[PDB]
Design a protein around this ligand. Structure first.
Ligand code: TPP
Ligand code: TPP
Ligand code: MG
Ligand code: MG
Lengths: 806, 806
């Protein structure tokens, strides 16, 4: 559960003290000095003479155009957290301002705790300076290695979705979400503005969006900064916000004056937020206007105004590095030396090199710190889900009526299971879906919870299962759902989210980024505890898009997921639910797991059930298993072909083809691969099937016919070094489809039962079976003409039931 | 179910024709002429010469100060109903404007249909004129004998509650509720203004309040007319209305100019109403501002301006009768003759005396007429409730563990029964309660319906079971609830309403009025079909008001109900539920009944159960029955006393006293009277117990001890001519109570078990039982001192269970 920390939502009821703002100004100066020492210096952190070009880095990498503004906001937020005792997580949208975050971690004392070799003295300062963006050092962005970070910020557009996710079901947590003005042009964040219509001020926390409007992107100005102030305020008010505006640094006003003005503006905003929270305890049915801060400052605000006669401060020329070579001229080194001395570090550091005590007296202590906040490290919060007994949801008719029974929909079983998980776990488990929960048949959870909706209600003929609080969030944006769930998991909670297969590509970037958060975490960051897994139910898949057609058919999610399987990280799982029982086993395993991205590919269509629960779990631990009840060959020597399958429709076609093969006396084996990554190379993947086990499943000399859900490229690229891999003949999706009957969909991809039987016959003896092969091939065309003439699939195809049903 | 009539909520989308307003003016003139002929004329309706004082009534009775304004509004509403085809019921708040209603019934043709002897010619006009307020004629007010009337209007303050009741669950019905400005000063109607917060524009109809602000009461001006127009509009807007205002007749403007102006204003109001209705089909969660019309006119608007030098028109002098004696002077007769000729009746009537055809061409036809509308005669709409099987709700533990078992609450059984009646009958059965449904334990109906509430919603920690539509209405006003239910029944629907016993007095007037609507209906009005019964669950009665005390104890409802039992009308039923099974039988009988007021007095406290369902019904058909299982005497000769009871606490005390009497060998009988009115005189009440049956129940010579719920006066006034009535010793409530333990409440009223045993012993032998009587009397005082010392009742009293429990 999310803990209550400090004294949440308290008003100051006093002026901001002068001593605190003294401390805030000194903090800002020292944070800018650290952020510059990290970029430019490799030695001599405190500029003991001789300070020469020997002390400067050979290759200057990093960013400065956002760092002083971030340091300003972070120092003021630190004063605020010390004063109010607020439970606060900062989300840094422009993550390229990494030196700001590392300077915070260093100054609040958490960096030395996490990394003991970076001491708080001259040698520790030298190591801290050298390690930024260095061989064998720390990254340039706001990284998982950086304490106090739940968001990398490298790939832009997801500060707001992550903020609204982090506050969900989390009522005491305050999140200032700093948003770059260039990042605000990206598609994800524009729609992430509208997510205050999906949170409740009573049951969820408060997100304060700080638009960091410094006017410029890389080498280009931002649209928001160059439209009129009337337009900007009107725009933010049309999205349910009260815009506040702060402008600074565009004239010669004293810094103390700027800090004072910001103190007053910040406390005004905090009082509006506290009023909203206090009102929500009585009335939470009508939405408030949350304050949001527009923070207009010059880009690179403390750097030299002009360098080489080019406007540097207040321009895009300060984005990455002013003084691109302070190492190769004497004039640029003098500019750099003057820039470092303009902060007066001589008074901010003591003799031994530690930041002076009066510079950090205004700082929060203990669990209130940014790097120490448990919501930033959501693995220490996390507790296991309390799971219902799986045998309660098993489809038992397979156990007595025989394999292949029924016309059930696989995802309804997961719906019931997830409903009871929600029942056992309220306020820790949440279901997201881009308008598609009821189309993936996960609506059984409406028996115990509602869709959280905080826009207007109009009627009850149209607004069923909607409520101002709920455990089902549903907005038509995959970016929103994925950011919500990722921030939900990163804070310590659990969740599933469902989607159409073809639109998972919309978040290929986001998944990639999350994999990079996991790949980095499992490799080099032990102090970050495991978080829950990102569970993605992929349904309404390529083979059954009757209503939509070719635009909704693209199973390429498997390919993008296969690219993140390296160095024994195991941060990826791709599971194929052949039926409801296998889906139960997969979902149980996935809900128990940690630090992974689990894509469970299950169909919503009426499909037969093949396994019992014990059989399903037994197939699960191996990933691939032989179906002894479907095989006609007792041992590996007898079979004239191995028929392997991965996916519900490929499984159905393999089984129907096996029925026809039985009538011709063909001895074959039947294999089902539930988990794709078990087929990976044994030396590469230590949890994949060993080579002996793989050869036992697939006969070394005998041909293997493989029917696969996605593109066959993904199977062939995975088994390349496996034994008997030359004989594998993968049949997968082949970018051929439309709106048409279900048999046609598999016909045009050469994955129907007739084509599979003909493929197996050709693997054995093309000459002996020539007449039967011809008969099958002309039957495919007759059965297509049947669907054209009559509008539905052939009775031979529709009515087929496996021979193993009693 | 409420029928859909005509084409509801249709906009005209055209100007009001000139021909229609020609007709409206001619209608208004002829309606005023009829309303004056009724008051003043007994002969010569069309003033054929010689028109002399012979033609005038000897005793002029009736009212005129509201009649021409009512005729104006009714003629315009008639034009509106003809044009739009609206389902409309008019509620006439100032019911003393009876000639207006009878003139309408006469002019739209329904009066001749209902009363064939009032033809539409000269003789019929003469009879119509003479019969108003005459010996052997029709009443002065807007009476049940008057077609098109659901509201008498004699006793003021309930036009608005009746309107909002008539539109409930009735979505196509339009109700213009005409409200007198003096009547608006009464307490009931002031709170009946606020009832637009309890109706839904989608599921309920539309009430248009027309404030008939003619400035004067009887001999006094009204508060609303003499406050500023700003105040009046501000007041009506603070109650959720849009005030429209029409002013007429206060200058020399032409009548047509007034009819035209009213046509535009009326169509504007209708368009706002139609907009509200169309919006409600999409959004019904947010309350609209319903239009209401302020209709400022001079009182007695077409009468002579001055009579005897006194301002008559536009004054309170025109309330009842200008020209109080047009029979006793020649000058007043000339004033009357000029008044009648000012309407030019010579052109409004043909030779034979019928109203000319062009005067009524604009009139509605068929079912759309006011007197023909089925919602005015709610007995033709009515259908029986579909009732669940009673045996499903029986308390079966009495059948096997023995009589006297348990500590159940009686009203929870009725709650479950009513819940299933609601389930079987949605939109035809409704539960009302003055904030007291959950305190009478009728909340089992929240399993199938909600409280209808259309004010604001704030949270869900406080707003459970509330919804913009529902079958439970609940406002803290007994007037509101009773008017809602009475208009609900008068329109054809069914309902229960619950209340504390002591506050039923708040509606003694209203009940009286409804009884007068029923007494008149069952005697002389056959064409009015039976309506459902007014069912009043009286709970939280006098004997168990622990929290409240003396202010909440007044059982005087029985007395006011007994005053309406005359002439074999049977419009009253008073039932005492001794336990849950008897309550089931009573409620089943009451829900089946028609044209009655059924007061069911049941306790909400934990009380023992004495009867099985079959026994309860067997006691029910007789009203009084002997308990053979509790009697120690086999025949009427053996018993030395008869112990009779009526009420759950009196029943408990009789049974506990019978237990003590058994230990002393006393032979007694036990009688329970479920229905009070069976004890009435046989010759007076043909459905009461005959004299032989009464003597069989109560032994002729043997003393009878009667324990009664209410004041003993009510029992003694009922059995006065019955045999053995001299020996009856009634023990009832005696205005002695407080906040104290339950035994104390019956102690201070001489109705406890010890005092009852002593009473019975004194009836037999005071001398023989002197020691035992003394012991009982001092035990009462010891058991009171026990409660004073320890705070709860004696173990001898609390723990007592009947000896018949196995
Ligand atoms: C989607 C995406 N496109 C491009 C980039 C490359 N990039 C890195 S930083 C940056 C500019 C930062 O813009 P802004 O939000 O205005 O930041 P600031 O002014 O704080 O530097 C860009 C385009 C990116 N990170 N993500
Ligand atoms: C509660 C109540 N008190 C007193 C009366 C006696 N009464 C009969 S008519 C009347 C005056 C009518 O007043 P208002 O509503 O202004 O009627 P209008 O101006 O239409 O005559 C009164 C007081 C009554 N009917 N009801
Ligand atoms: Mg920018
Ligand atoms: Mg008046």
């Amino acid at each position: 559960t999310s803990p209550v920390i400090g004294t949440p939502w308290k008003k100051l009821n006093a002026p901001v003290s002068e001593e605190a703002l003294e401390g805030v100004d000194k903090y800002w100066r020292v944070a800018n000095y650290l952020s510059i020492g990290q970029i430019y210096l490799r030695s001599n952190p405190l500029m003991k003479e001789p300070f020469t070009r020997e002390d400067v880095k050979h290759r200057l990498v990093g960013h400065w155009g956002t760092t002083p503004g971030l340091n300003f906001l972070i120092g003021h937020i630190n004063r605020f957290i010390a004063d109010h005792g607020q439970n606060t997580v900062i989300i840094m949208g422009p993550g390229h301002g990494g030196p700001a975050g590392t300077s915070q971690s260093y100054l609040d004392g958490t960096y030395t705790e996490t990394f003991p070799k970076i001491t708080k003295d001259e040698a520790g300062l030298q190591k801290f300076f050298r390690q930024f963006s260095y061989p064998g050092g720390i990254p340039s962005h706001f990284a998982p290695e950086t304490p106090g970070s739940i968001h990398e910020g490298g790939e832009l557009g997801y500060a707001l979705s992550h903020a609204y996710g982090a506050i969900m079901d989390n009522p005491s947590l305050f999140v200032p979400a700093i948003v770059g003005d260039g990042e605000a042009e990206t598609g994800p964040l524009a729609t992430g503005w509208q997510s205050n219509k999906l949170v409740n001020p009573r049951t969820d926390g408060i997100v304060l969006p700080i638009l960091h409007l410094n006017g410029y992107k890389i080498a280009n100005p931002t649209i928001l900064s160059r439209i009129s102030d009337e337009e900007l305020h009107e725009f933010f008010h049309g999205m349910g916000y009260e815009p506040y505006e702060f402008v600074a640094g565009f004239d010669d006003e004293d810094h103390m004056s700027i800090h004072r003005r910001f103190a007053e503006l910040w406390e005004t905003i905090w009082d509006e937020i506290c009023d909203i929270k206090a009102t929500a305890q009585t009335d939470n049915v009508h939405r408030p206007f949350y304050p949001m801060l527009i923070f207009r400052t010059p880009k690179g605000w403390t750097c030299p105004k002009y360098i080489d006669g080019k406007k540097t401060e207040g321009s895009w020329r300060s984005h990455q590095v002013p003084l691109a070579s302070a190492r190769d001229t004497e004039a640029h080194f003098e500019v750099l030396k003057n820039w470092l001395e303009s902060y007066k570090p001589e008074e901010l550091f003591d003799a031994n090199g530690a930041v002076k005590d009066d510079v950090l007296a205004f700082m929060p202590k203990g669990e209130l710190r940014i790097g120490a906040n448990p919501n930033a490290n959501g693995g220490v919060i996390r507790n296991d889900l309390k799971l219902p007994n799986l045998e309660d949801y098993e489809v038992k008719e397979v156990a007595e009526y025989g394999h292949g029974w029924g016309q059930l929909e696989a995802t309804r079983t997961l719906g019931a299971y997830t409903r009871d998980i929600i029942k056992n776990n309220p306020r820790d488990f949440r279901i997201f879906g881009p308008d598609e929960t009821a189309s993936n048949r996960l609506q059984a959870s409406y028996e115990v919870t509602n869709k959280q909706w905080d826009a207007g209600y109009i009627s009850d003929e149209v607004d069923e299962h909607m409520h101002v609080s709920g455990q089902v969030v549903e907005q038509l944006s995959e970016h929103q759902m994925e950011g919500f769930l990722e921030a939900y998991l990163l804070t310590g909670r659990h969740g599933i989210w469902s989607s159409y297969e073809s639109f998972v590509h919309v978040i290929d970037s986001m998944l990639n980024q999350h994999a990079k958060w996991l790949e980095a975490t499992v490799r080099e960051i032990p102090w970050r505890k495991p978080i829950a897994s990102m569970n993605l139910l992929v349904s309404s898949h390529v083979w059954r898009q009757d209503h939509n057609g070719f635009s909704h058919q693209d199973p390429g999610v498997t390919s993008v997921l296969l690219n993140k399987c390296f160095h024994n990280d195991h941060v990826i799982g791709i599971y194929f639910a052949t039926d409801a029982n296998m889906l139960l086993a997969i979902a149980e395993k996935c809900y128990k797991s940690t630090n992974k991205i689990n894509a469970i590919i299950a169909g919503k269509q009426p499909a037969a059930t093949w396994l019992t629960l014990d059989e399903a779990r037994a197939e699960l631990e191996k990933g691939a298993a032989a179906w002894d009840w479907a095989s006609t060959a007792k041992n590996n020597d007898e079979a004239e072909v191995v028929l392997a399958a991965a996916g519900d429709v490929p499984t159905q076609e393999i089984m129907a083809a096996s029925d026809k093969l039985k009538e011709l006396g063909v001895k074959f084996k039947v294999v089902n691969v539930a988990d794709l990554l078990s087929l990976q190379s044994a030396k590469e993947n230590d949890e994949a099937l060993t080579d002996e086990e793989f050869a036992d499943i697939f006969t070394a000399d005998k041909p293997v016919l493989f029917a696969y859900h996605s593109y066959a490229h993904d199977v062939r690229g995975l088994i390349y070094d496996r034994p008997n891999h030359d004989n594998f003949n993968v049949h997968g999706y082949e970018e051929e489809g439309s709106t048409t009957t279900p048999y046609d969909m598999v016909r045009v991809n050469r994955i129907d039962r007739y084509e599979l039987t003909a493929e197996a016959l050709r693997m054995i003896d093309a000459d002996k079976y020539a007449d039967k092969i011809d008969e099958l091939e002309k039957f495919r065309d007759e059965a297509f003409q049947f669907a054209v003439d009559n509008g539905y699939d052939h009775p031979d195809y529709t009515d087929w039931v496996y021979s193993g049903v009693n």
